[PDB]
Write a protein that binds this ligand. Structure first.
Ligand SMILES: Nc1ncnc2c1ncn2[C@@H]1O[C@H](COP(=O)(O)OP(=O)(O)O)[C@@H](O)[C@H]1O
Ligand SMILES: [Mg+2]
Ligand SMILES: [Mg+2]
Lengths: 336, 19
């Protein structure tokens, strides 16, 4: 563990300093179906001609990135994603750009969003939630050791793979920062109090968001919800959280230490760091090594009828990919 | 119930980010 994170940092630093660039072209792919939309872009299933592999292609309209003031965030997203390598992070296979758009081509995770299965089933049992939570704990351990904050944990950005394991996607708000940072970004239900209160914040916001995720997985609904974000914010800063009757005492004790408004007391941010979380009683039955090596049997395995099957994804309205004869935002995205 | 209140709320679908 201790020595693995040292070797991992060296490969990351090499790619962080000299990122890959322009490793494919749009005409090398056939576009098939939209897998998902987000706040900023669209992700399509594509097939790579020479090879026949299916991939998931994220498409960002440069003008829309500019209008929403996401230039720096989008450059972080590609720079960080092409440099990381971890069993529970989507792999970036190609990236390129044209006159109008930025493209990131990822491995296709056919099992669908955690969001869809969680809403359909209603809630996950604690052993089921724990299996997923352990993968996120290890993923944040790895990312934080590289000085990375993720800042957008939620079931909509978590994908289930063929073996039933998690793949974290969407590095849109990820940032490499050694001190504090100040950007107000993320999803209202998952925002830590210190973000809302315009305090400088650090990697501890990821551990708060983990608490929210575990709650929502096990309860079926977020700990703080309302119809308008403003009322969500008021509940988050008040810190008062109620637990469902069926939560175990161990689960409630862990969540009280993750959903801790006081930065100095929040698990993950203390002297022992992530080991406070790994050593908690709720994880007593968790074999961290076996999870990392993907040797544990997944509690739920999605159905697949073949390569290119999208049945675990919702349908979306398809739109044409337009490319202008004139280059847009050429040098804003020079390093992409 | 809390579940009923959530399911009747406007934020049961996929959630977008704030910026
Ligand atoms: N590697 C992937 N494989 C399959 N589907 C994906 C992949 N990456 C993203 N998606 C789908 O596309 C959606 C949007 O992608 P994301 O990167 O989260 O875009 P945004 O930043 O706009 O939210 C996700 O919620 C998911 O459904
Ligand atoms: Mg997303
Ligand atoms: Mg995003």
């Amino acid at each position: 563990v201790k020595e693995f994170l040292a070797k991992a940092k060296e490969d990351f630093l090499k790619k962080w300093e000299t990122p890959s660039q322009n490793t494919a072209q749009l005409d090398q792919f056939d576009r098939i179906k939209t897998l998902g939309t987000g706040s900023f872009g669209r992700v399509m299933l594509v097939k790579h001609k020479e090879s026949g592999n299916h991939y998931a292609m994220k498409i960002l309209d440069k003008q829309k990135v500019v209008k929403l003031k996401q230039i720096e965030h989008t450059l972080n997203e590609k720079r960080i994603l092409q440099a990381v390598n971890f069993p529970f992070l989507v792999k970036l296979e190609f990236s390129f750009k044209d006159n109008s758009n930025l493209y990131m081509v990822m491995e296709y995770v056919a099992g669908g969003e955690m969001f869809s299965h969680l809403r359909r089933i209603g809630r996950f049992s604690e052993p089921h939630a724990r299996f997923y939570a352990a993968q996120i704990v290890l993923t944040f351990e790895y990312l934080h050791s590289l000085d990375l904050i993720y800042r957008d944990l939620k079931p909509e950005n978590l994908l289930i793979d063929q073996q039933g394991y998690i793949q974290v996607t969407d590095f849109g708000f990820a940032k490499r920062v050694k001190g504090r940072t100040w950007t107000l970004c993320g999803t209202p239900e998952y925002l830590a109090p210190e973000i809302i209160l315009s305090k400088g914040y650090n990697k501890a916001v990821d551990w708060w968001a983990l608490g929210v995720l575990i709650y929502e997985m096990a309860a079926g609904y977020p700990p703080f919800f309302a119809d308008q974000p403003i009322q969500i914010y008021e509940k988050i800063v008040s810190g008062k959280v109620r637990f469902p009757s069926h939560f175990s005492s161990d689960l409630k004790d862990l969540l009280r230490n993750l959903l801790q408004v006081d930065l100095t007391k929040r698990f993950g941010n203390l002297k022992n760091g992530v080991n406070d979380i790994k050593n908690h009683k709720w994880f007593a039955t968790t074999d961290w090594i076996a999870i990392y090596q993907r040797k544990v049997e997944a509690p739920f395995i999605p159905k697949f009828k073949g390569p290119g099957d999208t049945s675990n994804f919702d349908d979306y309205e398809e739109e044409e990919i337009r490319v202008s004869i004139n280059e847009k935002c050429g040098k804003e995205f020079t390093e992409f | 119930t809390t579940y009923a209140d959530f399911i009747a709320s406007g934020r049961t679908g996929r959630r977008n980010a704030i910026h």
